[PDB]
Design an enzyme around this catalytic site. Sequence first.
Site, PDB file in Angstrom:
ATOM      1  CE1 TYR A 114       0.312   7.627   2.922  1.00 40.14           C
ATOM      2  CE2 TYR A 114       0.701   5.393   2.075  1.00 40.14           C
ATOM      3  CZ  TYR A 114      -0.127   6.317   2.714  1.00 40.14           C
ATOM      4  OH  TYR A 114      -1.436   5.965   3.057  1.00 40.14           O
ATOM      5  CG  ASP A 147      -1.974   1.186   1.132  1.00 38.84           C
ATOM      6  OD1 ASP A 147      -2.949   1.080   0.336  1.00 38.84           O
ATOM      7  OD2 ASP A 147      -1.790   2.210   1.821  1.00 38.84           O
ATOM      8  CE  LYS A 199      -3.838   4.616   0.430  1.00 39.35           C
ATOM      9  NZ  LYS A 199      -2.400   4.464   0.763  1.00 39.35           N
ATOM     10  CG  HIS A 238      -4.635   9.587   0.355  1.00 41.98           C
ATOM     11  ND1 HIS A 238      -3.265   9.679   0.282  1.00 41.98           N
ATOM     12  CD2 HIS A 238      -4.915   9.132   1.603  1.00 41.98           C
ATOM     13  CE1 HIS A 238      -2.734   9.229   1.409  1.00 41.98           C
ATOM     14  NE2 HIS A 238      -3.715   8.918   2.237  1.00 41.98           N
TER      15      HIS A 238
HETATM   16  N1  LIG Z   1      -5.870   5.756   3.453  1.00 43.96           N
HETATM   17  C1  LIG Z   1      -5.383   6.517   4.509  1.00 43.96           C
HETATM   18  O1  LIG Z   1      -5.794   7.634   4.804  1.00 43.96           O
HETATM   19  C2  LIG Z   1      -4.424   5.814   5.476  1.00 43.96           C
HETATM   20  C3  LIG Z   1      -4.311   6.210   6.822  1.00 43.96           C
HETATM   21  C4  LIG Z   1      -3.457   5.503   7.689  1.00 43.96           C
HETATM   22  C5  LIG Z   1      -2.727   4.421   7.199  1.00 43.96           C
HETATM   23  N2  LIG Z   1      -2.846   4.041   5.843  1.00 43.96           N
HETATM   24  C6  LIG Z   1      -2.126   2.952   5.184  1.00 43.96           C
HETATM   25  O2  LIG Z   1      -2.308   1.857   6.172  1.00 43.96           O
HETATM   26  C7  LIG Z   1      -0.975   1.473   6.553  1.00 43.96           C
HETATM   27  C8  LIG Z   1      -0.950   0.927   8.002  1.00 43.96           C
HETATM   28  O3  LIG Z   1      -1.650   1.800   8.968  1.00 43.96           O
HETATM   29  P1  LIG Z   1      -0.736   2.725  10.073  1.00 43.96           P
HETATM   30  O4  LIG Z   1       0.476   3.243   9.391  1.00 43.96           O
HETATM   31  O5  LIG Z   1      -1.699   3.642  10.785  1.00 43.96           O
HETATM   32  O6  LIG Z   1      -0.080   1.553  10.941  1.00 43.96           O
HETATM   33  P2  LIG Z   1      -0.561   0.190  11.655  1.00 43.96           P
HETATM   34  O7  LIG Z   1      -0.768  -0.764  10.594  1.00 43.96           O
HETATM   35  O8  LIG Z   1      -1.851   0.455  12.523  1.00 43.96           O
HETATM   36  O9  LIG Z   1       0.649  -0.166  12.690  1.00 43.96           O
HETATM   37  C9  LIG Z   1       0.802   0.633  13.931  1.00 43.96           C
HETATM   38  C10 LIG Z   1       2.243   0.272  14.519  1.00 43.96           C
HETATM   39  O10 LIG Z   1       2.058  -1.175  14.674  1.00 43.96           O
HETATM   40  C11 LIG Z   1       3.384  -1.652  14.839  1.00 43.96           C
HETATM   41  N3  LIG Z   1       3.394  -3.127  14.495  1.00 43.96           N
HETATM   42  C12 LIG Z   1       3.397  -3.720  13.275  1.00 43.96           C
HETATM   43  N4  LIG Z   1       3.356  -5.034  13.463  1.00 43.96           N
HETATM   44  C13 LIG Z   1       3.368  -5.257  14.780  1.00 43.96           C
HETATM   45  C14 LIG Z   1       3.392  -6.420  15.545  1.00 43.96           C
HETATM   46  N5  LIG Z   1       3.355  -7.659  14.961  1.00 43.96           N
HETATM   47  N6  LIG Z   1       3.392  -6.281  16.887  1.00 43.96           N
HETATM   48  C15 LIG Z   1       3.426  -5.065  17.517  1.00 43.96           C
HETATM   49  N7  LIG Z   1       3.412  -3.924  16.813  1.00 43.96           N
HETATM   50  C16 LIG Z   1       3.387  -4.038  15.439  1.00 43.96           C
HETATM   51  C17 LIG Z   1       4.166  -0.912  13.822  1.00 43.96           C
HETATM   52  O11 LIG Z   1       5.423  -0.495  14.485  1.00 43.96           O
HETATM   53  P3  LIG Z   1       6.842  -0.967  13.782  1.00 43.96           P
HETATM   54  O12 LIG Z   1       7.114  -0.300  12.439  1.00 43.96           O
HETATM   55  O13 LIG Z   1       7.835  -0.529  14.964  1.00 43.96           O
HETATM   56  O14 LIG Z   1       6.759  -2.579  13.757  1.00 43.96           O
HETATM   57  C18 LIG Z   1       3.280   0.295  13.441  1.00 43.96           C
HETATM   58  O15 LIG Z   1       4.026   1.525  13.425  1.00 43.96           O
HETATM   59  C19 LIG Z   1      -0.383   2.834   6.492  1.00 43.96           C
HETATM   60  O16 LIG Z   1       1.041   2.620   6.531  1.00 43.96           O
HETATM   61  C20 LIG Z   1      -0.660   3.256   5.083  1.00 43.96           C
HETATM   62  O17 LIG Z   1      -0.052   2.306   4.161  1.00 43.96           O
HETATM   63  C21 LIG Z   1      -3.682   4.752   4.972  1.00 43.96           C
HETATM   64  C1  LIG Z   2       0.289  10.734   7.316  1.00 44.37           C
HETATM   65  C2  LIG Z   2      -1.105  11.069   6.707  1.00 44.37           C
HETATM   66  C3  LIG Z   2      -2.064  10.106   6.400  1.00 44.37           C
HETATM   67  C4  LIG Z   2      -1.974   8.618   6.744  1.00 44.37           C
HETATM   68  C5  LIG Z   2      -1.641   7.629   5.640  1.00 44.37           C
HETATM   69  O1  LIG Z   2      -2.192   7.782   4.530  1.00 44.37           O
HETATM   70  O2  LIG Z   2      -0.861   6.689   5.984  1.00 44.37           O
HETATM   71  C6  LIG Z   2      -3.176  10.794   5.879  1.00 44.37           C
HETATM   72  C7  LIG Z   2      -4.396  10.328   5.422  1.00 44.37           C
HETATM   73  C8  LIG Z   2      -5.343  11.233   4.918  1.00 44.37           C
HETATM   74  F1  LIG Z   2      -6.523  10.763   4.495  1.00 44.37           F
HETATM   75  C9  LIG Z   2      -5.080  12.591   4.879  1.00 44.37           C
HETATM   76  C10 LIG Z   2      -3.849  13.075   5.345  1.00 44.37           C
HETATM   77  C11 LIG Z   2      -2.890  12.190   5.842  1.00 44.37           C
HETATM   78  C12 LIG Z   2      -1.589  12.353   6.372  1.00 44.37           C
HETATM   79  C13 LIG Z   2      -0.791  13.524   6.482  1.00 44.37           C
HETATM   80  C14 LIG Z   2      -1.291  14.803   6.233  1.00 44.37           C
HETATM   81  C15 LIG Z   2      -2.216  15.365   7.122  1.00 44.37           C
HETATM   82  C16 LIG Z   2      -2.714  16.647   6.923  1.00 44.37           C
HETATM   83  C17 LIG Z   2      -2.228  17.400   5.844  1.00 44.37           C
HETATM   84  S1  LIG Z   2      -2.848  19.058   5.540  1.00 44.37           S
HETATM   85  C18 LIG Z   2      -2.210  20.140   6.805  1.00 44.37           C
HETATM   86  O3  LIG Z   2      -4.354  18.950   5.546  1.00 44.37           O
HETATM   87  C19 LIG Z   2      -1.278  16.867   4.973  1.00 44.37           C
HETATM   88  C20 LIG Z   2      -0.800  15.566   5.176  1.00 44.37           C
END
Ligand SMILES: NC(=O)c1ccc[n+]([C@@H]2O[C@H](COP(=O)([O-])OP(=O)(O)OC[C@H]3O[C@@H](n4cnc5c(N)ncnc54)[C@H](OP(=O)(O)O)[C@@H]3O)[C@@H](O)[C@H]2O)c1
Ligand SMILES: CC1=C(CC(=O)O)c2cc(F)ccc2/C1=C\c1ccc([S@](C)=O)cc1
Length: 303
Positions: free
Chosen positions: A50, A45, A79, A112
């Site tokens: 990013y 993803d 995205k 996104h």
């Molecule tokens: N569409 C969006 O708006 C959006 C928003 C948020 C996230 N995402 C996508 O979803 C992905 C994942 O969500 P997130 O980044 O919020 O993180 P997450 O998947 O909820 O992970 C939270 C923390 O969990 C830890 N972790 C991973 N495996 C583990 C395990 N087996 N045991 C204990 N801890 C563990 C990781 O630390 P370590 O790195 O130290 O292992 C990570 O920093 C994001 O990276 C991005 O690709 C998209």
């Molecule tokens: C880290 C991050 C994420 C998480 C992710 O996709 O893993 C994210 C997701 C969204 F739907 C929107 C924004 C973000 C973001 C950083 C970000 C936040 C606010 C802004 S502005 C100040 O509105 C710009 C960037």
Amino acid sequence: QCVKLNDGHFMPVLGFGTYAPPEVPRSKALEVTKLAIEAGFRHIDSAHLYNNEEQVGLAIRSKIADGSVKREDIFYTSKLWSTFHRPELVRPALENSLKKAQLDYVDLYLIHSPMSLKPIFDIVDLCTTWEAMEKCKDAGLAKSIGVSNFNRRQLEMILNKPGLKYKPVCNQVECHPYFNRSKLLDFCKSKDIVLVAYSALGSQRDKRWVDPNSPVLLEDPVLCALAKKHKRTPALIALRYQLQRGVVVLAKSYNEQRIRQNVQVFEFQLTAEDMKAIDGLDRNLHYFNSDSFASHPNYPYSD
Ligand SMILES: NC(=O)c1ccc[n+]([C@@H]2O[C@H](COP(=O)([O-])OP(=O)(O)OC[C@H]3O[C@@H](n4cnc5c(N)ncnc54)[C@H](OP(=O)(O)O)[C@@H]3O)[C@@H](O)[C@H]2O)c1
Ligand SMILES: CC1=C(CC(=O)O)c2cc(F)ccc2/C1=C\c1ccc([S@](C)=O)cc1
């Protein structure tokens, strides 16, 4: 295993999350994406946001080059960032993400977020954004298209658009035992839209958007007690919970041990009683909780 999307394509049910904060060297994404693929992850993803698509595409291409995988064995998502919602910006934004990664296509391209930004907020008819995503799938730049962070009403807008050509294959949203999205999940299932869970492990708790006083999901006592019953870990319980709800689940780890641990989610299952105990954790808690989103006129959680 894989789930079949409503356009005929297939999505692996466990995905690797590639976001790391800007304090982490860009080159770590290259190393941990190769580890994820080595470990068994096939869904990757990423996002323009990013700032890692060059490194992530190199990792995928490098694992094709050594013969560990073929391109068609990898599901790669990028995205569309929110400063590119204007329909004329969607294709160039995608072609940029493709050039960065050096790939011919993405398997999945998402809007996104619904919260449009000046190309300072913007007002954009997201139905027009969507038409431009449709054309990208027509062009073969994205195999599938979907949305991220859309609530029920914003998704209904797309689904009821006059002359819609392609349904979003998915809605990628915050989803975990504290915020399990049961109603949104039911709605998606009724439309053959896959819900994909992010922050399934409690989020990275980044202080710019997450209150550090919020409870720590992976320290939850019910998850701990489930992890001890199954001799697994709280992270694994939280991941398996989504798969048994029919949710595609992402997991970010930049840690070699944890990346490999997470694939164990296929190696066990939870009972009805386990599932009911986890469903009883729901507390309407989204970890991303910031003025930057909350003051926006299309904020998804305005509910
Ligand atoms: N569409 C969006 O708006 C959006 C928003 C948020 C996230 N995402 C996508 O979803 C992905 C994942 O969500 P997130 O980044 O919020 O993180 P997450 O998947 O909820 O992970 C939270 C923390 O969990 C830890 N972790 C991973 N495996 C583990 C395990 N087996 N045991 C204990 N801890 C563990 C990781 O630390 P370590 O790195 O130290 O292992 C990570 O920093 C994001 O990276 C991005 O690709 C998209
Ligand atoms: C880290 C991050 C994420 C998480 C992710 O996709 O893993 C994210 C997701 C969204 F739907 C929107 C924004 C973000 C973001 C950083 C970000 C936040 C606010 C802004 S502005 C100040 O509105 C710009 C960037």
